[PDB]
Ligand binder design. Structure first.
Ligand SMILES: [Zn+2]
Ligand SMILES: [Zn+2]
Lengths: 179, 258, 246, 243, 258, 248, 254, 179
RNA sequence: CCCC
RNA sequence: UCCCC
RNA sequence: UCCCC
């Protein structure tokens, strides 16, 4: 049986190297989580029965715009695609104008808007985000005027209430309730 | 921040609603599976656990001798309270009942009181000195939507399995609380000019705009509560009235057991 | 009480479809943006509106719209036996539904990061006080010039000796078979929809639908009274603007 | 009342060193991050773990580690006489010492600025409810995958008609001479250290040391039940995937 | 934020004060128009609405039989409370009594108590058993300054128009509460070494620095209260002592139904 | 049980004359953890005062940009009175706290400590008539002990009225069965009464009696004040000798 | 908070060299001082100084209804106020965590040792019984208010006079007291203990253990507190030491 | 006797110049604090029985790093050496890369990390800080990883359980429980 | 309640 | 008005 | 102190 309870001894610190789910104390390695003990290339890790997601480079991510500067969008990143558990490192991510569309985008405001909900790919430490891929972008936007949920109109967002129209980097999933 | 997942779920629910569907395939006047399980807390004088879909609630009943209220001697007393405890939802917060908790408990209380499910005259011990007090306490276990109806179900079920603790207060022999009606509440999520009977937590992402209707065993309406910030279309209310009465009849059937 | 209805007349002489006496007065408070004093039968209520003001604390703020707050409070001397001050479950419940009734009507999108506060005080209570307050609050809102889709108008229907009555009195509340408060949105001079609905008691399905018709008839009548209070206010500001000129 | 021990046997039939029937079940709550339902004698108990989650407001945020909250709460209907809802000195005390036990164990440095919240509700109370709760809480934490040094396992020892008794029942608590809750850290499959210790009553110095040995034996037994419960869960999540 | 208009208004009041004038042309010892309306709450045992300029407050009195105090088995009880509700003033917040509200009720109570305006011993029903309890409940409607004196006036007017509810409580014919004195309080805003009797709200923009003196029928001082963070000149106090007794007398003469 | 008399042969129930204070003891720096402190007796009153500040923001929103805020809490211990009193503030303690705070706001140079708090706690360990005056005296000593800049000192006494006679510093009996009770506190500056920092009264007094009461209180106030000065002088000697106690 | 960390460093440095910052032995209480009758008017009372830590405890007694459960006994109720007076740390609010805990520990020592004969406090069975309010008031917090308060409370009870005449219940008389619960708290830092922690020592963290014994050296209550793991061997040792200290403390009552 | 009580008249505004422990009103100087009256060069001051510490250009201070910038680092100043009483002018003090070791430090994170307890000297208004002195610098550092308190070893700091090592302006007092 |  | 649960 | 007011 490869299953281990937290506190189960895996061996000396010198026999194996500490990996995910395992901790070092008094020269020993122990399980920190219940799950399947796995050892590969001297590395001990426990695959936990309940993994706490960690956002890393390459992950896909759901977030909300909480502040726009001039060449910068501050994104409240909250969820990591493929996992319902709240990420260990929820926080503020940064969306620079460069990574919005891989085109030319003067104001970051032409792409992203205050309180927009948005789907992105992590491309660096500290939650560095990109929306370049077609799958990425805004998923839900509210009308600047009447705060009404904008509706996708071809390749433009339009308020169905006041008729206003606004333009952003729209994700292909906009309005589908999925990401 | 928790808002974010919920806003997206909202778009999904509305998208399916636009195509005349619910995300779990249920019909618009269809309840999730109901399971009603009596006697789950032995110490309590009466009790019931209810599972409604994945929503779970337990209701305990406690009885003890007490002062009648000066306004109405010759009358037993019923007091309903709910704890929507942090153990049920990431959003339930430790402290005194919020409005929601007060509202839920009062709607449950209203069903029982107006249907006169419990004969309070029979709970009189002494004229205007001693009378039985019935405590009904609702404890949310798992909130996956419509704690309200789950709680109404469990409360009336627990009352139905309640043993009056006579031979402990030396008031004689233990007897079953006589219950003479079966209040059932039906709550629907109203979305624009549509309704969804028995909303799930996911569906609730659209907003907290509901209508609850409660009936007795003869299909009389005994309590109603509109809740949330919206305008209720009269025509929708009319349809939802007949529907609700019907749904309550079916639920009421689940109390036969056989 | 033996019977509540005799020869088609109620304890107070009313017919089944007749309102209690009503008085509505706008602009009775200097230190409030809008206000209304209102009597409904033996109910005496006073309503006050403050806003759109800044929201304290800074965290209850909503970035996309005004927040609405509504407090219904019963003065200690307003009831037969002195009521210990401070909210109870019932007042909190009433404050919530009343809030929700207006959330539906006030154009809150116009005032992001703001509060619109509605305080309603019952000085003397009788049956249907929550209905009296909604009527006052709605007037007070209009007196305050806060933008709304239309009027909020409220009355309850009761059931006494098996018969539906408009605007129940105390004896009918306590000894009758049902009590059912309504409030409506009125637009284009008409009932448009239901802003508040509650009920306790025992009614057949047909009684419920009939109750709505009865309530609407009463609400229209009260609505003309609300309009008239506002019309006087309109007359008063205009003739004052002539007083200065005079 | 008259006698607590007659002929080596306690009021309910048990021996001086016998647990009451225990029952442990992981993942019983859809909405929580981890959960456990647990019976201990007539104790019925349920724990839910939420976290690591963002702490609200912020005046509670810790930059270096995470914070642990624990709330022991009794449902009105869980005791012989309807208990009025809400905090309570005993409850507040129990929550404090319960949270202290997990601070000594949860790897809180792993999650800075986060909260790990633990809720335990006693649905039916008997003697040792706090003990039942600590057991469930530990299982819920493991269920929720929060890194820990090891398990927390808890039992109380009583003293009756001059004799130490494992896992006292109501009557023993009420009429006994002492009552002493324990919890231990379990690591390398053994009782390592003491995470919780309380005693009320009257005990000789030796009685106390004897009471610890008695507690540790009960604990090991309970710990194994906690383990099987987690083992079932582990099988269940694999079966899940295979679907 | 709110501070800004107030601060400017403070400059205006102070500017006028420098030229020996008040905002509205009143003298420095002159009350605004007072109006006292009894019986505004029929359901109450006694009640009164007072208008003091644009300031409005209503007081209601309630009496019910009850427990005497162990220390005072031969005396009825008087309890005074105030609500300075958000309804009056945008500054008033919801919640239990603020310290402002506790202070106000206690000043009113001190006036009534120390003047012995109500014969408590005549409110005994059964020594050590049953005694009348008088609830004096103060309710601000419109705060345009000096709710304190307005309340004191309304409280005694209400007491003077109270009717003991003996019948309701099967205790005999009803009767008028015996009132034997007429406590009146006079409150001044202190700015430097000048006083302004009966400050308006606009005048209060200067600061919350006041002096209240209460007298009985015979011009005995019966209660006094200095409030606010200031230093009170003793010479000013002496002069204001006299002015106040006088003002109180004039006020007292408005109770002649006048 | 009502004494019936109160004044006999020009003597009060405890033996003093109309113009005599109760025995008083004042000691500064009696607490290690406070920035300033004072233990004070005044008749049967036994009180302790403690000062912390200038400190804090604080909490956050409470902070005042242009000046310090002052807080003063008056609290009676459950065992300080005849019948054990449930802990927590009541309306009376709230009122006493507010007016006490007000007396010091008038005198502490708060402009010197923007965005700060200076906190004042006073505890009635044993209560008799005048406990609020006792606390005010103890608090001013504590403030000086903590070196917080002030216009001058705060000194406090009540004048009572018994059997028609004004008396200085009433005792419990005179308070309970007398005709009036009137606490004062004054600012002392340049060795003398400069103004009134606190004034309250209840009971029944003539305009003339009120004016005589002020004279009586000022007199007593000057007596107490010298005690306060003495208590601080002693403290002055202590930090003095304990300084060159290190260099010795 | 910054200063606490640095002081924490200093405390640990001297721990390593197996010596406390003030040269006490790891099993040594600071100077203890017990002054009874500090609050006349109270039926019982006592002040305790333990080093620079100061605490006063007042006792009050009045007749009242007995709890439905036990109609054959008087009542003892223990409360504490850790008033902001004792340190810049204490907050004005209602009894918080630490204060509830301190008061309950003191109560348990008194209750489990049965120092007061609750049966002697009945007036009319099932109707009238004496209620003993024990109120703890911290004055100066220099560490281990717990042990000081426990000392102070039993002193005050030993100096209590039942106010019978006041209540027309006959002559006044001394409250009969039949045991001397004393409590001993040590700071635990890893595998080491420091009996009677000073507040300065408490900078390392609030990780303590408290043992309370009776007249005859039986343990009557214990309480581990704080977020740390207690080693069993250490416990065994500290048990004997604690019983030791309690015996020594007890003689200050003679 | 030179002792004074607050409120005590010292003299006339013209006579003397108001110094510390004295205030003015209506042309007259009074003691603001209790203590010793001193008149030197026409300046009246009172040495207070309980001085309230003022942090001025030159003082030795104890602070903690709350924020790190590029060249700027924010240190929360909490004490003035030689005086236990909290200084009236507690606050935020900016430390610059130039004022660190008298050498060269690009990474401001090369000498002062997050949450580090530090010991600095004041060099300008606004609590302008510096540690170009051997006696100054970090007194107690936490590992970036395990957050553990790092012990001192020669001229470097190492985690006694993570082993990993960090380097920074080490105060000669580091780990002494003294500053 | 008020006084403490 | 406690303490156990 | 439930429910109504
Ligand atoms: Zn729009
Ligand atoms: Zn490290």
């Amino acid at each position: 049986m490869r299953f281990v309870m937290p506190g189960d001894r895996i061996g000396s610190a010198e026999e194996y190297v500490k990996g995910e789910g395992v901790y070092e104390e008094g020269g020993e390695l122990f399980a920190a989580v219940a799950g399947k003990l796995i050892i590969k290339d001297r590395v001990a890790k426990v695959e936990s029965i309940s993994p706490i997601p960690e956002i890393v480079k390459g992950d896909v991510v759901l977030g909300r715009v909480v502040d726009l500067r001039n060449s910068i969008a501050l994104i409240e990143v909250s969820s990591k695609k493929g996992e319902n558990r709240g990420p260990s490192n929820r926080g503020i991510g940064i969306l620079h104008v460069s990574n919005v569309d891989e085109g030319y985008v003067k104001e970051i405001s032409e792409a992203v808007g205050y309180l927009d909900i948005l789907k992105a790919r992590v491309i660096g430490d500290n939650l560095r985000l990109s929306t370049k891929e077609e799958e990425m972008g805004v998923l839900r936007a509210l009308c600047s005027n009447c705060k009404t949920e904008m509706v996708r109109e071809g390749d433009i967002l339009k308020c169905p209430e006041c008729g206003r129209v606004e333009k952003r980097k729209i994700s292909t999933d906009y309005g589908k309730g999925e990401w | 921040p928790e808002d974010i997942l919920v806003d997206i779920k909202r778009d999904y629910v509305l998208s399916k609603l636009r195509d005349n569907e619910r995300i779990d395939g249920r019909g618009f006047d269809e309840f999730r599976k109901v399971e009603i399980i009596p006697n789950v807390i032995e110490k309590a004088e009466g009790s019931a656990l209810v599972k409604l879909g994945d929503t779970q609630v337990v209701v305990g009943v406690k009885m003890q001798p007490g002062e009648p209220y000066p306004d109405t001697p010759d009358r037993g007393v019923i007091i309903v309270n709910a704890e929507l405890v942090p153990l049920a939802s990431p959003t339930f917060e430790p402290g005194p009942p919020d409005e929601n908790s007060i509202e839920l408990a009062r709607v449950v209380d209203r069903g029982i009181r107006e249907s006169e499910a419990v004969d309070l005259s029979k709970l009189v011990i002494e004229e205007g000195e001693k009378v039985w007090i019935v405590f009904v306490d609702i404890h949310a276990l798992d909130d996956d939507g419509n704690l309200l109806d789950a709680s109404a179900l469990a409360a009336i079920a627990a009352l139905m399995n309640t043993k009056v603790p006579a031979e402990r207060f030396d008031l004689g022999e233990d007897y079953l609380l006589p219950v003479r009606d079966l209040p059932v509440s039906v709550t629907s999520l109203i979305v624009g000019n549509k309704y969804l009977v028995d909303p799930s937590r996911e569906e609730m992402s659209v907003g907290d705009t509901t209508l609850t209707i409660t009936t007795d065993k003869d299909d009389n309406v005994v309590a109603m509560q509109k809740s949330g910030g919206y305008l209720l279309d009269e025509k929708l209310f009319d349809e939802l009235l007949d529907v609700s009465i019907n749904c309550a009849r079916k639920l009421r059937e689940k109390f036969k057991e056989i | 009480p033996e019977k509540l209805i005799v020869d088609g007349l109620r304890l107070d002489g009313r017919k089944f479809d007749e309102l209690r006496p009503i008085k509505i007065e706008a602009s009775v408070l200097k230190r409030a943006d809008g206000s209304c004093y209102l009597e409904m039968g033996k109910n005496k209520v006073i309503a006050a509106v403050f806003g759109p003001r800044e929201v304290h604390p800074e965290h209850l703020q909503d970035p996309s719209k005004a927040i609405i707050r509504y407090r219904y409070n019963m003065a200690p001397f307003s009831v037969e036996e002195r009521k210990r001050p401070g909210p109870d479950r019932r007042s909190i419940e009433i404050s919530k539904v009343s809030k929700e009734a207006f959330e539906a009507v006030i154009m809150k999108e116009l005032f992001p990061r703001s509060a619109i506060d509605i305080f309603v005080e019952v000085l003397q209570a009788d049956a249907g006080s929550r209905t009296a307050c909604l009527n006052a609050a709605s007037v007070a809102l209009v007196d305050a010039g806060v933008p709304m889709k239309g009027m909020i108008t409220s009355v309850a229907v009761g059931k006494a000796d098996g018969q539906l009555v408009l605007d129940p009195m105390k004896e009918e509340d306590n000894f009758g078979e049902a009590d059912m408060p309504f409030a409506f949105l009125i637009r284009n001079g008409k009932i448009e929809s239901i802003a508040l609905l509650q009920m306790d008691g025992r009614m057949t399905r047909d009684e419920v639908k009939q109750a709505i018709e009865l309530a609407k008839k009463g609400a229209l009548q009260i609505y003309e009274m609300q309009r008239e209070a506002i019309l006087r206010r309109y007359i008063e500001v205009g003739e004052e603007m002539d007083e200065i000129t005079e």
